[PDB]
Amino acid sequence: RNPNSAGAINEVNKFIRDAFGNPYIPGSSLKGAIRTILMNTTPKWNNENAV
RNA sequence: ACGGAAACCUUGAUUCUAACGCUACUUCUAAAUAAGCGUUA
Secondary structure: OOOOOOOOOOOOOOOOEOOOOOEOOOHHHHHHHHHHHHHHOOOOOOOHHHO
16 A cells, blocks of 8 residues: 555564664574474474474 | 787799682573464455
């Protein structure tokens, strides 16, 4: 819709920042993505024993 | 008017010198601030 006409953008989800206000990507986020990739492609972790 | 009188068990002395409540030890281990959008129109 038009951002200056209706309610439109009421809330914006903030990006992660440090104490200086500069955005960055935490290592925990990339590590979680890498861990998902590794766990899904290892047959000894992607089995019914994972539940 | 007594085997009695007179006579300090007294003076000077530091329970003192030396000695680390010390040696070794990561508040550590895994962990995406992320998932779901139905039904009506």
